[PDB]
Amino acid sequence: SAVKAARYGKDNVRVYKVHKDEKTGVQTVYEMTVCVLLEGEIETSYTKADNSVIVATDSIKNTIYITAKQNPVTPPELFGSILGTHFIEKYNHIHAAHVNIVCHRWTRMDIDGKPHPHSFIRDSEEKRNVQVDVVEGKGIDIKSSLSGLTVLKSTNSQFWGFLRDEYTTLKETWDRILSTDVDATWQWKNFSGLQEVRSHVPKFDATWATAREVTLKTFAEDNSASVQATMYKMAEQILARQQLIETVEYSLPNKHYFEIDLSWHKGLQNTGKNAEVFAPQSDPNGLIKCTVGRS
Amino acid sequence: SAVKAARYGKDNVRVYKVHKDEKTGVQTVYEMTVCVLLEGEIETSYTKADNSVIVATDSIKNTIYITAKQNPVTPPELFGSILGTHFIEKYNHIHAAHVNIVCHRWTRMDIDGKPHPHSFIRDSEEKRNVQVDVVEGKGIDIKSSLSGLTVLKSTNSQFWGFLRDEYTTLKETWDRILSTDVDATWQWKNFSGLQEVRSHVPKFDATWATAREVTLKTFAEDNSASVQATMYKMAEQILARQQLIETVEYSLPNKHYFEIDLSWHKGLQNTGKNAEVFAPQSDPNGLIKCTVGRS
């Protein structure tokens, strides 16, 4: 036997950081969950009990905190790039660092219509994420995403004209609920290293903003022919608005809301145009995915 | 042996309802999870295989949907009262109905700074809940709550002057993070039946609004001496603002954020006044509770 692939590190490292403006009194908080996995000339730790090649995961954890103390943790694309660069430069035998960051929301509270200088609310488990792969000799590959963005529209979703054969029982519809949990990823042009990442820092927050805005507006305004068609529209617009993105990926569940026929009870009409009460279905769910790139 | 208590019903009944204004085109959605448990002269179903006394849980489920179709589902206090009243009036041998409703957020989206007529976002897993106990001969007892309201303040929390003995290692502090998940319950005066509940309908939404507003403002503005002291302030104000409430209950975890001493690494200062990076702790957590009533 032989090692064909190996990576190891520390997962689920929770990190908080606060910024305090001494002058204004305004504090700003950041909270994330970090995973760092390293690759390199480490096979002998697996095959020969050779721990000398192991940068301890506990040290990896320490390094995350130390890096957060000495550097900005925002935008996460930059922080992840700094962190991954550290490992491959510090350790001659480590040749790749894989950094995943989940960013948790702490939105400043508005109290009596005024933003509060140090109090925050978790407005949703929606996450902003990055996957930053720092590979010696191959630059920095960044995938940015938003996830856990849960939405519903009560009309202006349709689904008709699909294939019908002996396995088909679904009725065509010209008016249904559409609800999903949005998982949207935008994949950046390869960066040659940390300098290039730094040169584009403002684009990270701006592109996340765009992705979220486009997602919401398209979902709300598209009289959807299918999840496929709507998600593609979202992806097209994001690519058109940021040339440094190469591809956009969407992964969308169709979280079904079923009509409930109540006509067995006193002739109650609750279907079609009379549909008011529905049964949200926990499972199963459609799952629709696509990766869109430039033509 | 003998049955000392018995209740049975349907749990986890997911319910959606839409309201459509034909004239404006504006649609409004509601989504909840309902549990209904009945009590009554049903012991023989347990002891003698006598299913004639069982209103099937599947029928209970149907009844929830039917009631939602024929009545407003908002405020949940009213809907729960209507539902529970139905069971004890419809079935001579059923003498209590216990209705729990979890209300899920569907906040109307703002697109290009305009509210969208039929698209919604789940802004947080914060829930609005009711527990409505309809008991024949004893009216309607309603407990209203908000839960899953997660907040953090980065300063203006303190904890000193607590008991110190041979089991104590916690250092006193004059400046710490405070983060919690708010579980707040307001218990209404008993109502004699559905008419009385109906007579107060506007107070349900208004009191939920007050409870949430007071919670957020007190959390943000109180330079907290302890979780105990802050939560009490919240409870006092809610009672002062709605005389139909008899008691206010808070259940608050203290979700710890630990300082990280980095001085072992290059003399880095990250404690006390220099504390910027912290380790959020998943467990354990303080848990602080109180029920406040009128003096």
Next chain:
Amino acid sequence: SAVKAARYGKDNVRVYKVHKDEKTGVQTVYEMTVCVLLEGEIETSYTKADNSVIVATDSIKNTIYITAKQNPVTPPELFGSILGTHFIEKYNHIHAAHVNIVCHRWTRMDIDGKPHPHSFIRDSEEKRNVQVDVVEGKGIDIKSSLSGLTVLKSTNSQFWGFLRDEYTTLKETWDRILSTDVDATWQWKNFSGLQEVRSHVPKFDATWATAREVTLKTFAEDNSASVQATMYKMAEQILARQQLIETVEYSLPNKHYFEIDLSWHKGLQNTGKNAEVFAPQSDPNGLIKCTVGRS
């Protein structure tokens, strides 16, 4: 306003303990999650910022570990009694201690048909729990339970003869699947204090064993007329087998498995006697409860 009730402490305290027999080499592990909430003359911590009455939750945590170091952690009924007794005896102003313990399974592995001296497997998330309320002047109240015991029988469950009216659509059946998650609680006679608890120590493990055995055998062997009827049989037998128990509580969801009519596809027969493939339903679910005591 005034405090009507108050309790506070540390939740989610994870605890592991190992026993090592130096002579045999056999190691035995225990893992639990502990919650301790105290009550007493502590209202001024809520109303007057008086932290002198607060035994810090962090000290409560320390105390849990210290108690685990100096005492057996098994059976959990004893450990909880020792822990709660400590708080009310140590602190004059603390008059009640509420101890909840969740015990996690670490079953010794069998390797090559021989029990291994120090390796364990989590065979299920089934838990063994205790709720131990130590109240000054009122002894020790113990509720013991098993939870998360998930079972299924593929036949020998029936449900017919239930009430049928205009809200009923459920068909009667003489052969259905029954699956549940068992939550079973046995409530002990009040104990006057720690000595009395100690005098009965062997009965705690033996009664848990009995409760589990009776539950499984009755579930497997009862041709069930209803969940109500089956659970009552379980409760009767436990009470008959341990006189120090006063009541038995069961809380059982009916986790539905629906038939799937496939006759629309090539006349496939998959209902009634031909039913082979079913759709497990995540929600809703029946929920059936009862407390059984002595006649």
Next chain:
Amino acid sequence: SAVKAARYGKDNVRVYKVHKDEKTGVQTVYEMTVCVLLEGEIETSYTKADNSVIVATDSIKNTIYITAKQNPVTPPELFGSILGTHFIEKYNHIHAAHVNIVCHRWTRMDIDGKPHPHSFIRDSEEKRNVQVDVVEGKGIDIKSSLSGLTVLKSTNSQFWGFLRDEYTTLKETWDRILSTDVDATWQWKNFSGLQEVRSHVPKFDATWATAREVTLKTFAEDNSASVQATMYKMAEQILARQQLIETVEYSLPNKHYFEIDLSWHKGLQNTGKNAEVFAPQSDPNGLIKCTVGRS
């Protein structure tokens, strides 16, 4: 823009099947969660609102149930192969089917030391899984796995000799707890189609058994130098015992159990050789991965 990749289908399809031996009365149950995602000439559903190319996900769901009715659902490798083959053969324009199956445990109960003919227990959330990729022109690629296998050993784990630099604070140890959740995958030689899969059917259950046996025995018996070294040993042995496997993948978290220094309290000794009470840590955790193939 253009579609670079696309796949869609039904996720979270829960499936139960029962086998009843009319002659013996012995019933056998199977429960799984199925996901099927299709690829093919479907881009126009995304780009041109062309739903004619969509095999509805609801039809995919129906097909899963129908296939389960007409075929064995065990071993899951075979069932997944049959299912995926169906889609690519039935639909000219569908060229790949990706089938994921999660198998849930229903272990026959032993009542009074005799196996019960129709009652089962979920002994753990350990899963047996398959990923079966049926690609037209490229056969059937199967990855089999076990997951959620949670284990602990209380000694005979070590970790010393790792790299030490200015980021290192972890002390070397010659005796620690090791606990993990095992995720083990064995990747089969490509099969040319369904016939070849069928020709090897007995090897699927036997190799799963081997993987599990080797995992448990190696974990229990290896005086572990590191997670890396132990997992490699597991992978080597599985490859040696089934030549139709090409690679073995392990993904193992190191779920830390920290010592607790209690010497501040009455000089209590609870570290090193005196360590009895530990604090299980929910996060962070080491994460160790490797893929092992043939030299």
